[PDB]
């Protein structure tokens, strides 16, 4: 990882270990997307496109030679920077255990919010599609604590129509989960071993499968931390990665508008 200029920063290694261990936990908890979607292995730092397979024809018709341009998806790279003071980072070697890191977490939350917004609603500039854009997969639901049990069965019938099988899971808003609270074992038994996930991002529910191979995530470099500069008395660091995301089968996904 030589492109991360790590050996040129005035910090002993213990402070590096502390910073990494503090960031990893918020990434483990705050990324909802990685729980069901699938992940393809790391490639490198310079991989710069992914192939679809199609071809676009630009030539005329009455020609002896014909030609066209292949198509692909270009990755995304991001970078965020923050500042940390040196006296407080140095108080660690004297013995204090609860050192103060109060600007790391603030940006560590914004990174995750941005990524989840991309996965759930998509950005048109890069030409991606979001899970809330396949509109024609809709059913209806109610409000009384019994309507949910009915909607789950009516959805598994449509799954059974096609070839989708395997374990199922439900993804629901947090505030709506209050009304249906009094019974939970019935919901878990109707899913036939399913799991419930509650999130604050979306405003309704949706139902998905978990057999494998329907949603893919392409990573060039995982999230990493590195050095930038030395301002006056406060060191400056950054965090970065490169990624993209594709949805293969629009059939293993049902949106339950309330």
**Are β-strands 215-230 and 50-57 bridged in parallel, bridged antiparallel, or unpaired?**
unpaired
Single residue of 52, 140, 203, 257 touching a second copy by CB under 8 A: 52
Q: Which of residues 168-227 bind a second copy (CB under 8 A)?
A: 174, 177-178, 181-182, 184, 189, 198, 200
Q: How many CB atoms lie within 10 A of CB 214?
A: 19
- 114 by Cβ neighbours in 10 Å (0-12 / 13-18 / 19+) ranks as exposed
Nearer to a second copy, 36 or 199 (CB): 199
Q: Cβ of residue 68: shortest distance to ligand RBF, in angstroms? A: 5
DSSP element (H, E) containing 2? none
**146 binding partner (options ligand RBF, a second copy, none; Cβ < 5 to 8 Å by kind):** a second copy
Given a contact cutoff of 8 angstroms between Cβ atoms, the answer to whether 168 and 156 are in contact is yes
Instruction: Say which DSSP state 177 is in.
Output: G
249 binds a second copy (CB under 8 A): yes
Asked if residue 107 belongs to a known ligand binding site, the reply is no
The candidate with the shortest Cα–Cα distance to 244, out of 161, 72, 128, 150, is 128
Q: Is 45 in the site for a second copy (CB under 8 A)?
A: yes
Residue 12, sorted as left (phi over 0), alpha (psi -120 to 50) or beta, turns out to be beta
Residue 57 site contact among a second copy, ligand RBF, none (CB < 5 to 8 Å, cut-off depends on kind): ligand RBF
86: partner contacted, choices a second copy, ligand RBF, none (Cβ within 5-8 A by kind) = ligand RBF
Q: For the beta carbon of residue 38, count every other beta carbon within 10 angstroms.
A: 13
Sign of the Cα pseudo-torsion (2, 76, 222, 214, in order): negative
- Ligand-binding annotation for 203, yes or no, is no
Task: State yes or no: residue 2 binds a second copy (CB under 8 A).
Answer: yes
The residue among 79 and 96 lying less far from ligand RBF, judged by its C-beta, is 79
16 is in an annotated binding site: no
135 is in an annotated binding site: no
Cβ-Cβ contacts under 8 Å for 255 (sequence gap 6 or more): 132, 134, 135, 137, 138, 139, 204, 206
Provide the minimum distance between the beta carbon of 220 and a second copy in the complex, in angstroms, as a whole number: 9
Closer residue to a second copy (CB): 14 or 138: 14
> What's 95's DSSP letter?
T
92 counts as binding a second copy under rule CB under 8 A? yes
In the window 63-82, what residues touch a second copy (CB under 8 A)?
Answer: 64-72, 74-80
Catalog residues that contact ligand RBF under the rule CB under 6 A: 55, 57, 66, 68, 77, 79, 86-87, 90, 233
Cβ 102 to ligand RBF shortest distance, Å: 18
Q: How far is CA 245 from CA 49, 144, 189, 257, in A?
A: 12, 37, 32, 25
Q: In the bound complex, what is the minimum distance in angstroms from residue 85's beta carbon to ligand RBF? A: 8
Which of a second copy, ligand RBF, none lies near 12, with the C-beta cut-off 5 to 8 A by kind? a second copy
């Amino acid at each position: 990882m030589e492109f991360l200029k790590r050996s040129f920063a005035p910090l002993t290694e213990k402070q590096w270990q502390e910073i990494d261990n503090r960031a990893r936990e918020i990434f483990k908890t705050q990324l909802y997307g990685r729980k069901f979607v699938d992940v393809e292995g790391p490639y490198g730092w310079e991989y710069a496109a992914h192939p679809l397979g199609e071809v676009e024809v630009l030539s005329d018709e009455n020609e002896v030679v014909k030609w066209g341009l292949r198509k692909s998806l270009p990755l995304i790279e991001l970078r965020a920077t923050f500042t940390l003071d040196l006296w407080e980072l140095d108080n660690l070697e004297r013995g204090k255990p609860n050192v103060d890191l109060s600007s790391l977490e603030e940006t560590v939350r914004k990174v995750a919010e941005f990524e989840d917004e991309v996965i759930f609603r998509g950005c048109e500039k890069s030409g991606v599609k979001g899970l809330l854009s396949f509109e024609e997969r809709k059913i209806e639901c109610g409000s009384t604590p019994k309507d949910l049990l009915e909607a789950i069965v009516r959805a598994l019938s449509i799954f059974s129509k096609d070839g989708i099988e395997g374990p199922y899971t439900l993804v629901i808003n947090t505030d709506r989960w209050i009304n249906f609270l009094d019974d939970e074992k019935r919901v878990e038994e109707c899913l036939r071993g399913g799991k419930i996930i509650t999130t604050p991002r979306i405003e309704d529910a949706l139902v998905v499968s978990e057999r494998g191979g329907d949603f893919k995530l392409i990573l060039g470099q995982d999230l990493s931390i590195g050095y930038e500069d030395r301002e006056k008395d406060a060191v400056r660091l950054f965090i970065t990665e490169t990624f993209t995301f594709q949805v293969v089968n629009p059939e293993a996904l049902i949106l339950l508008k309330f």
